[PDB]
Subunit: 424 residues, 4 copies
């Protein structure tokens, strides 16, 4: 462990974002796009979190694997992540599956997508391969995980963090020892084992595996020949590494970038619809759990050119009132009440509206005299005049999609089967 | 006139924006910046108008002449106008006066700045040279002025537009004939001559001269040797061309880009302080005279990455009310009243403020319980708590600078002198 | 026909490059890449021809359709064609077929690829849709084809140019009248009909169709419902437009950009292997048919950062001799004879080589004492020591691929079945 | 010393490259350009060395101080060093002296340039300030000098390296102790003191001072008020820090990046004309002292788009012979002999030339039947037909400039004076 080691491992490293793959539990949010390209934060996409942590961690060589509905994703990487110069060892390579006969190849698993592209990744000559799930929201520093991987003399290093046992049936539960060496790993159990001394919580894998380059190539080619295998990192390989005792665990609180050290680390995978809504409006509160006014760990995105947020008087000459809300650029709010809401770019709300705990994805047009409560308005939805959402549960659940918790989702297809011409 | 002559006139052409110039009528606004680099519109600088008209007119070769306090200007061109490629015949040159032998070189006049850089401009190999004053705000199409210049068989074409005879003592008044050939030109008269049939208005030069390049080079070298010359385009050259009868006039309403054809063309040179303030708030009204939500003639600028505009509750849990205002990105408005105002980037207003007909240039901090009206807050001004501006004119004259019209201007040096340290 | 019309139609236009789709007659040159991504010119790819003609024709909105082996292509557009800003109406959108169920969708035809993406192209709001085959090499101005399309009052406008009847069985042969109105169109005939008064030549379609936006959308939806249709522009639609008499013909000599007006227009589709090799060395001769030292119609590409071309002495201290050859950057030629050749980037040739009428695609390593005549060395081929190519026809045809005209092609797979470790 | 201290020392840091400076020992080379902007290496400028070491050392915040003839320099930074984003904490500022009141401001010395811009540098909020002379050619790692500065608890760390006592009268000679603390510093002595145990060599300052920022600001404001000071870092400040015992020395062989560890570190300041010529041709030899085919420490520059280097046959159909030369892109060499030479971009050599130990800066045209040896041809020089250089020293002294060592220098003004018009 030398003094100039913390700086030379990111440069000998290469990150691989398994962007591609939809989130099925997000219903129609991700019907026309990949989960990493779901909008978030007023101006971000989820994959801006798993990319700006590579940059600020020094890892300037990324590999974005994209399968399902990637036009918007690729078009976002193109416009916001193509400032690189390949001559200074940095790049964001897109690795969709390469078709030679109209659908002959198609990425059978998570770990069968790093094996199709294993002739391109060898050419990078990397020693440490970070394996990032980029449909997640976090502010980690992977040059403090890579060290903890190099100090321990590990082959694979799984970033683990504890979560409530109630939600630990959707993640990879493990069990460690005094030396943070994984002893028992099981993927997506039906009865998540608890931690020792913490019966109400389980030590879960985040989908962030650091691998020596030599061991990963030798483990996938040793796994690609397995017909029985399901070709996934959690469900096939990490048990294989674990059962040889070459798998260590890296606590996330160590390599988490927070502005308040007294707080707990922030991890939201935006699993269902409810946690997507809840995760945006936790940017609109007074004290957000996620700091985005931070200049020591900024998040890079498509810096679209939009005019200032305009607030104008309604048809009656009256004021427009706002409370704990975000209004991004392009918006035009004509004298209506906006509360606990998040308006993204280009949202044009007309007069006399009432908007409460809403999330208005971009290019939404809200017509005159609309009332919106606890809803998610999808991209380009042209809400008609006098529409009421979030006051009649037996109404909203027979028009739009309504989650068990009360969250409504509105899409153009939902609003075009109702008869509202939404071709504006 | 060939049918394919409109599209290859902007490629044989080269624009020269005379960015340098104090614009002394602005008093303290331009103390630390050049007149072009004054902030405008929530996110623009005035030189984004004289540059985005060259782009959308096809003129991709520009030459920005900068002398006085150009650090902010040059830093703006570097970060928002350096997307060009030199192998596609397009660039944004910066031609500030070349310095050797302990600060020897400085331009004697407007036209003694286009001469020193006459060895670099000949390299461009440009047939037509557009000469743009870039301290002006307008939406023109120079590929309709170049045609009118090539149809007429003109050598130099002055863009002229009528203005009230009261303000015509600041511009170049001319007189034309039936075939738009300048007969009488006089620069900055003390008694501006009126138009025929319009006694209340004068036909003024805008500062926009299109030149046959073979004539410009021969005219400046024939002028640079003149010992009594003032080395100015209006004060020396344009009378010389006029007196030979080689000077035509191009009406601006023809080559103006406006979304409402029933309206009059828009020209504001932001002369004094009052017309700066009035010009911004004319973006905050309901029907702006200047359209900036126009996609057929967009304005290019520094697309700074800023978070959404955040509105939060005050100390007391209460709402914040807005009326005909622009709130750009980065702003944080803690539950205060904002009316007829324009907040630029990064403006952090604290609780219980009242803001009326104000313009808050970037990085301004308004403290708790401040009242601001009919004022212009300079960049990074840290307004202290309980400050009151625009209610006692006799008490705003001594503390700050107050125009004759009632407009107040606040700078850090004005506030630092009263002992309100501005170190944030 | 107004005077400012030549400049306003490219802005109301959108180009669609049918890049996607391999060139089967190129054998193994396009086995790991799409034909638009075939290298050409020492530093270009074929799709830099059908893109730089959109830029210099003012068409800044392109749509690159990519299906077969597009990793290289996409990775080229990302690194050399992503300098655009979407806020000044300009972009290069990549439109690969969007998969929702692992190969469910896959682009059944050339005109069934503009129909899958017909919800994205409507959003561009474009009046004139240029349909460009981008597997071709030419220097055309599409703002002189668009006019000739607007003057004639046409619906569709097929760029046609005469070719020898011998090769006219691979293109779309048509037949026109006095008003350049197509009368008889047949796609890929077995007996190409000749021209009137030129029995030895046929009037052939280039794959460059300009279409009013309103007619194209109504023609593909009216064609997508046809089960009998083969979904192709030539084989299905252009006969349908022709049989209604709405199809005009635009001669290519009019809208061709040449630097010698006495010459004939340059069109090479790089059909077979022989014409690819012939087409590059026609850059190496003394008077190229294709001018690439032209600054009035430059070609934009991935401006890779490479050191100067180094020529060094061989093991014996001797000179290296060159004759009518192109040596791009990165190359290291150790004192060998290079004749009528084209070396791309990074080509390291070792001592005592002899290279004649060769094309060395990038990262090729030629070992010591090699002789190469009339060959095409593919990307990254590690030629071993003492290899001899192009002197024994019955030898080179049993090792590598040898066309009927004598041209040899060398790939890594060909040189790894022969036992030469080529993993360098 | 923390294990994560090497990687967050380049982020709390800010580099200041003093680009301005005539470098008068170069005579006519730097007549029209600054010493930093002198061309080097076939494609680089000297300031690409002092900048790519900040990038690859993690220092992404640079401050380029430019005074003398900076148009080419600024135009280079604009086109090759303006890929940075201000929201990711990285930029390349240009801090030329601010001008108001008819050319008033000009820096009195090296250290009176970092003071005027002391209101802009405090905004950076930098703990460590690297002070780089950028008129020098070396491959250093400043994140190994910053650590050595933070281990030692030093305030200011001077990078020192030994040089022959013959040339030690041009640099800052010092004397150190066991713990590398400067005891005696004297700037540009007339009798450079020797090292202990190495009588033939002196321990010289490179011009590379690392500073505690809290100490720099307090040292320049405490120096700017000095009436007898010369306002220089070596001549005024570094003796002041030395005499307090707060000045440590950092050996350059530790923080040098070299591909052959058995070699000595590479430092060439290109002092006179002879060491400029010798320094370039040391790129053309077989084993360069400076490695530029190194991918672990690449040099970033203006990646100009140029065609491949073309070699063609002469008038007579004959070959062109090369020996240990560099031919960059754009060159066209018509069958002539080139030996031990360095041709930059766009050099068009005509037939029957003989070129030996020459350096042809860009856009040079060599005419037919020219003989050139041991000379330096200035940018855009149009050598006429049958010119002979470097065979008659008595006839090259009068026509051009000839050093005492035998090196010739050719400029356009030297050739224009002999009546060889240089207008191409
Ligand atoms: N203004 C719009 N109207 C309708 N659909 C859109 C609009 N903008 C984007 N889309 C589509 O909405 C889907 C999701 O895109 P995005 O919201 O950008 O991920 C894609 O099918 C887009 O092509
Ligand atoms: N946050 C800030 N605080 C104080 N001065 C600033 C700040 N930002 C820019 N300036 C200075 O304000 C002046 C005008 O800059 P600008 O408003 O950008 O034209 C220049 O002297 C800048 O360096
Ligand atoms: N240095 C290399 N060695 C082996 N294969 C390569 C190399 N560079 C690119 N390739 C591959 O060669 C194929 C063609 O790429 P390209 O020649 O860039 O179109 C692709 O499969 C690339 O991944
Ligand atoms: N083709 C050219 N012909 C004559 N002068 C040039 C040319 N290119 C650049 N220069 C001038 O040469 C001087 C040095 O420029 P540079 O060699 O780029 O540092 C400056 O005065 C440039 O404007």
């Amino acid at each position: 462990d030398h003094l100039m080691l913390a700086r030379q491992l990111p440069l000998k490293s290469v990150a691989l974002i398994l962007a591609g793959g939809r989130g099925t539990r997000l219903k129609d949010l991700t019907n026309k796009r990949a989960k990493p390209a779901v909008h978030f934060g007023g101006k971000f996409r989820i994959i801006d979190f798993a990319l700006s942590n590579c940059i600020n961690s020094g890892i300037r060589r990324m590999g974005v694997i994209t399968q399902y509905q990637s036009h918007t994703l690729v078009q976002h990487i193109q416009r916001g992540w193509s400032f690189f110069n390949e001559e200074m060892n940095e790049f964001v390579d897109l690795l969709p599956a390469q078709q030679r006969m109209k659908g002959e190849n198609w990425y059978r698993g998570t770990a069968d997508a790093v094996t199709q592209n294993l002739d391109i990744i060898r050419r990078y000559k990397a020693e440490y391969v970070v394996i990032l799930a980029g449909d997640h929201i976090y502010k980690q520093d992977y040059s403090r995980m890579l060290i903890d991987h190099v100090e321990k003399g590990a082959r694979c290093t799984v970033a683990c963090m504890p979560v409530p046992i109630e939600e630990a049936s959707a993640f990879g539960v493990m069990a460690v020892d005094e030396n943070d060496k994984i002893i028992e790993f099981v993927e997506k159990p039906a009865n998540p084992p608890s931690m020792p001394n913490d019966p109400s919580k389980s030590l879960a894998s985040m989908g962030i595996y650091v691998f020596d380059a030599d061991y990963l190539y030798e483990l996938l080619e040793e796994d690609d020949r397995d017909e029985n295998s399901s070709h996934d990192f959690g469900k096939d390989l990490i048990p294989k590494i674990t059962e040889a005792g070459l798998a260590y665990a890296h606590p996330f609180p160590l390599s988490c970038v927070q502005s308040d050290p007294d707080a707990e680390p922030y991890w939201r995978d935006v699993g269902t619809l409810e946690a997507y809504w809840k995760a945006n409006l936790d940017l609109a509160s007074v004290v957000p759990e996620l700091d985005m006014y931070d200049r020591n760990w900024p998040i890079r995105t498509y810096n679209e050119s939009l005019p200032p947020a305009k607030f104008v008087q309604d048809r009656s000459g009256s004021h427009g009132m706002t409370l704990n809300s975000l209004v991004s650029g392009g918006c035009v709010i004509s004298g209506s009440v906006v509360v606990q809401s998040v308006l993204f770019s280009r949202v044009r709300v007309n007069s006399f509206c009432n908007i409460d705990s809403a999330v208005l994805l971009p290019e939404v047009w809200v017509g005159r005299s609309c009332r919106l409560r606890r809803c998610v308005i999808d991209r380009a939805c042209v809400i008609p005049e006098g529409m009421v959402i979030g006051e009649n549960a037996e109404e909203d659940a027979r028009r739009f999609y309504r989650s068990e918790e009360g969250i409504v989702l509105v899409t153009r297809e939902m609003l075009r089967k109702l008869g509202h011409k939404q071709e504006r």
